[PDB]
């Protein structure tokens, strides 16, 4: 279920799911580097009915994974609310900004 765009934690992913790319939801595929910065989403947990903060750190420094492309936009907002915005490359400040895939890191309630 984690490799589907409709998995609940992926509600503001614009990118390739890292779990389909040799990584997991919280680990970068081998040889790709986490972004220290990210957009954040608030996603509804369908089990407990509570909303959770998800941090969408990208994995960077390798060319596009190309698998499990998603474009979900729950509570996403334009660049004037920059850290809620997912039409920018969150690898933009990495040593190498080439975008590989997006992770869905659970922060908390």
């Amino acid at each position: 279920e984690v490799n589907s765009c409709d998995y609940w934690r992926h509600c503001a992913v614009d990118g390739f799911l890292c779990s389909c790319c040799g990584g997991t939801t919280t680990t970068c595929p081998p040889g790709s580097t986490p972004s220290p910065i990210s957009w954040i989403g608030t996603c509804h947990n369908p089990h407990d009915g509570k909303d959770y903060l998800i941090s969408y750190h990208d994995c960077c420094g390798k060319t596009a994974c190309g698998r499990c492309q998603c474009n979900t936009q729950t509570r996403e907002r334009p660049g004037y609310e920059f850290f809620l915005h997912n039409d920018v490359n969150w690898c933009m400040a990495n040593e190498n900004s080439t975008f590989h895939c997006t992770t869905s890191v659970l922060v908390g309630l």
């Binding site: 420094g61 936009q73 334009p78 660049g79 004037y80 920018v88 933009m92 190498n96 080439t98 975008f99």
Partner: protein
């Protein structure tokens, strides 16, 4: 026979459009595809490396691209640049060095613009702190960051002034920047709150007139910024929606999702039914045509799953783009008329633009 190069584009400038192909699946090989809108013919292309952005010089002679290189692509030193290309030969002429923070992101028009006088390129930076970058076209130089635009996003040129532009800020207002002849900030001003960021967020894409801009919101309201005077006056909301529209939850959706036909005041907007949180980038079920003076819808037509558009004021045309295919419409009357579709113009484009004709 003898193979030769050095040739110019085969169709005249007034026939040309530019489809910015991000090639997201292989984003390091983005490019601009040049097409003839009159017959769908492919005319040529400009390579733009990683996540290129593109615009045509106001005078129609050059193509400006913005991109990122690294010495070994996925490793090595970063170089962010603007490139100047000859429009007729589709050849590289000049590289202008930028600081390594040009915006990397989807191809909204407002990320890479120019002043009305064509003397400055005006681009969005994100480090991830935001600022606006200014490039002096005549000098081939970066000037300096417009630091005043921190916490703001995107560039809306004021077509009634030679070197002024606005940006949308996190307080729901607009910041106006007026450049001097050297490209540095000569003055600035900040409007009152136009929209509630929390309760009625707007799409950044302006429906841009000569002295005002309209913006649509996530809930189908309209806001305006009038910059006829030295200070910007803001207004709204008014609704795009009648009761029937509201009962079926029609809202706007797309990327470069609006356009203004300036002579008539008709605003074009991609819309879809069954709106709710998370549908703001949905493809167009329909295109609505709004009279901005009477504030009523005058037409509605099938959207062909379009996401982005552009308007030509000089030929009374609208292009729409669904990511891969470009639709050409005649908008000389209230109801648009579909002329043709150019299939397979891109693999992943969210931006099309005409080659400028006239516009002085």
């Amino acid at each position: 026979e003898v193979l030769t190069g050095g040739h110019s584009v085969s169709a005249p400038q007034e026939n040309r459009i530019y489809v910015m192909d991000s090639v997201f699946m292989h984003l390091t090989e983005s490019r601009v595809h040049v097409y003839d809108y009159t017959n769908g013919k492919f005319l040529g292309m400009v390579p733009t490396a990683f996540n290129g952005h593109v615009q045509v010089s106001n005078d129609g002679k050059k193509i400006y691209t913005m991109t990122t290189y690294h010495e070994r692509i996925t490793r090595g030193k970063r170089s962010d640049v603007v490139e100047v290309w000859d429009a007729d030969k589709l050849t590289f002429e000049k590289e202008i060095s930028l600081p390594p923070k040009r915006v990397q992101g989807l191809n909204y028009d407002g990320l890479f613009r120019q002043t009305t006088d064509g003397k400055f390129i005006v681009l969005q930076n994100a480090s991830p702190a935001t600022s606006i970058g200014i490039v002096d076209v005549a000098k081939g130089d970066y000037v300096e960051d417009v630091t005043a635009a921190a916490g703001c996003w995107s560039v809306i040129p004021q077509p009634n002034r030679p070197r002024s532009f606005m940006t949308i800020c996190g307080d729901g207002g607009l910041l106006t920047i007026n450049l001097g002849e050297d490209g540095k900030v000569a003055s600035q001003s900040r409007s009152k709150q136009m929209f509630s960021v929390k309760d009625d967020p707007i799409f950044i894409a302006p429906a841009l007139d000569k002295d005002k801009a309209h913006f649509v919101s996530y809930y189908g309201n309209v806001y305006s910024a009038d910059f006829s005077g030295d200070e910007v006056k803001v207004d709204g909301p008014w609704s795009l929606l009648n009761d029937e529209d509201k009962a079926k939850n029609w809202v706007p959706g797309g990327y470069n999702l609006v356009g203004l036909h300036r002579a008539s005041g008709r605003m074009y907007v991609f819309m879809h039914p069954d709106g709710k949180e998370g549908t703001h980038k949905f493809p167009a079920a329909e295109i609505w045509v709004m009279d901005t003076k009477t504030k009523q819808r005058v037409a509605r037509i099938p959207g062909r799953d379009a996401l982005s558009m552009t308007i030509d004021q000089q030929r009374n045309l609208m292009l729409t783009l669904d990511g891969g295919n470009v639709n050409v419409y005649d908008i000389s009357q209230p109801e648009p008329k579909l002329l043709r579709t150019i299939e397979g113009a891109a693999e992943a484009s969210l931006q099309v633009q005409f080659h400028p004709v006239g516009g002085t």
